[PDB]
Amino acid sequence: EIAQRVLEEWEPKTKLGRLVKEGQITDIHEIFRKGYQIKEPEIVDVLLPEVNLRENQEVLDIALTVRMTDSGRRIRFRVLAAVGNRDGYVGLGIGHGREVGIAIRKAINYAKMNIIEIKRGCGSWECRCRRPHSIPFAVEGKEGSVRVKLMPGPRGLGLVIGDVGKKILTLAGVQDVWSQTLGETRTTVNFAKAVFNALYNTNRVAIKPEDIERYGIVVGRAM
RNA sequence: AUUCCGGUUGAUCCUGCCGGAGGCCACUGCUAUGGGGGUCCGACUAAGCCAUGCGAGUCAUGGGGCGCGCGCGCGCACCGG
Numbered sequence A: 001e002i003a004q005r006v007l008e009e010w011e012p013k014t015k016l017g018r019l020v021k022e023g024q025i026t027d028i029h030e031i032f033r034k035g036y037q038i039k040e041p042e043i044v045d046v047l048l049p050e051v052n053l054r055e056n057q058e059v060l061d062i063a064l065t066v067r068m069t070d071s072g073r074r075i076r077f078r079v080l081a082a083v084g085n086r087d088g089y090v091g092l093g094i095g096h097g098r099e100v101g102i103a104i105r106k107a108i109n110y111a112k113m114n115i116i117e118i119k120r121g122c123g124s125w126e127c128r129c130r131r132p133h134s135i136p137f138a139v140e141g142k143e144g145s146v147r148v149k150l151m152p153g154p155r156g157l158g159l160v161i162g163d164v165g166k167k168i169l170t171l172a173g174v175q176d177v178w179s180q181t182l183g184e185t186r187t188t189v190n191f192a193k194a195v196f197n198a199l200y201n202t203n204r205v206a207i208k209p210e211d212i213e214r215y216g217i218v219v220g221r222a223m
Numbered sequence B: 001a002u003u004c005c006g007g008u009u010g011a012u013c014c015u016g017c018c019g020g021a022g023g024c025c026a027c028u029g030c031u032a033u034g035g036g037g038g039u040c041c042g043a044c045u046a047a048g049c050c051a052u053g054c055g056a057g058u059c060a061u062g063g064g065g066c067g068c069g070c071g072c073g074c075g076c077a078c079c080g081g
């Protein structure tokens, strides 16, 4: 139903969209580690239909801003939103507008266009299971003055981190994690971006084939 | 739970302090059915002052006497340990 609807009620404008429509690309993982550019949210609407449910479209922050003139004040609205599948895919976006609906739509579209793969595992001294319920090793991220460090934890220990990190990690599919932070966390944008970059940095660590089995590393979706 | 949130601008990012949110101890406001267990109750200021009653005796198998009942048995003080 939705598959054919979204696939035949849309005409692409890029070669990636053309490939995805004609059917040379079928799985979400074939678009990432080649240096492609993504300019169409329909690509992700097709290769990942889970990012269209309202259960997976958390809005993270709304802010009001001002521009002064010789007449008066012109108001603007900034919206920070996140989208994701709960099995290894997450994206973050910002949108500016004069009304909240415009802002939210633009933010969700930018979030769709900015999506990343992450790795998952156990990693902890205290669980040593091979189930991908957490991250496999400790990682660091930064944006602005905010410095985030994520550490793996055991099962049943749920997301010891602020609310924005809770939401982003829940949408990425992580269930248990410890955290340490520095800087001004009361900036939602930079806190969220630092968590996002910490998650992205799971792919910048060099591993050996043994570690994969030792930690139950999963790239993207599982089973 | 190896956690955060509010506050300096016409709007923003920092630094930096104040506050909120948790636990334990003492005093106190309002209110109060039951049982069990425990190493709780004039310590913080005056180690300031005290009426009254009690908190250290015991030995007759160490000694002499005195009283009470049929040499013997009970009771009292003293010497002595």
Ligand SMILES: [Zn+2]
Pocket (backbone or CB within 6 Å): A122, A123, A124, A127, A128, A129, A130, A131, A133, A153, A154, A155
């Ligand atoms: Zn585990």
